[PDB]
Amino acid sequence: MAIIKREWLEAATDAHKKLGWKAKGAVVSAHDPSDTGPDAKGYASRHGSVVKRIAEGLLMDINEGADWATSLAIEDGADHYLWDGDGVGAGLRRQTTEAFSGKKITATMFKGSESPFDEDAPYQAVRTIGDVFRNKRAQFYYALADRLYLTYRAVVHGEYADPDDMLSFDKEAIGEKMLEKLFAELTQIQRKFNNNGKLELMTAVEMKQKLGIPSPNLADALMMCMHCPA
Ligand SMILES: CC(C)c1ccc(O)c(=O)c(O)c1
Ligand SMILES: [Mn+2]
Ligand SMILES: [Mn+2]
């Protein structure tokens, strides 16, 4: 039921260096907030197809967490910032826009439970995006998985892919310790049964309650930065 193979993640590590291409595009950052409790904060940032920061935030309340993440976005030179606005993050827009006052950074609330982005468009690579994915969480996790798989095929099987459709982890920038944390989370993201035959993923709650593993905050952050607002 897992959607991402560890082998793809290994291949994607420094893939831009292996295949000789450079990060090009917008810088997108995303934050997975949490209230004070067991669930850590997540932050991820990419420059185009190259992930450059993965960070985890401990011992913070929700507002401290948002301050931490917006500061990271600023440090990273983000053009776009997203955060998880389902549940506890629903009220964070005010603090977030305040943090970016005077800066050219857009802030977008990500709601993983909503219907997929552009749900009426034909599903590519009669059947629409909305027939395929239950919600945005599923849609953007599969976008991530698709990038990783294409990168794996390019790195390991020498199959050409446009760098725009790939994803590389900058190991030097991210750090080995945080990369290992991320990978342990990404390999636990799993499909759940859906009675309308759509792709749907286990929620953070189901993951910890049904099979006792910690919330994938770093993976959720990375997944949200797959969406580039405008
Ligand atoms: C209640 C728990 C498991 C939970 C719910 C929703 C989220 O968006 C989370 O990001 C999270 O880390 C934990
Ligand atoms: Mn969340
Ligand atoms: Mn979380």
UniProtKB/TrEMBL annotation:
Q: Which residues bind Mn(2+) 3?
A: 32, 217, 220
Binding-site residues for Mg(2+) 2, renumbered to this chain: 32, 35, 84
Residues recorded as binding Mg(2+) 3, renumbered to this chain, are: 32, 35, 220
Kindly list the positions annotated as binding Mn(2+) 2: 32, 217
Give the residues the record marks as binding Mn(2+) 1. 32, 84
Q: Which residues form a coiled coil?
A: none
Judging by the UniProt lineage, the source's domain of life is: Viruses
The residues the record assigns to binding Ca(2+) are 32, 84, 220
- The protein, known as: Gene 2 protein
The major lineage groups are: Viruses, Duplodnaviria, Heunggongvirae, Uroviricota, Caudoviricetes
The gene it comes from is 2
* Location of this fragment in the whole protein: 213 to 454 of 470
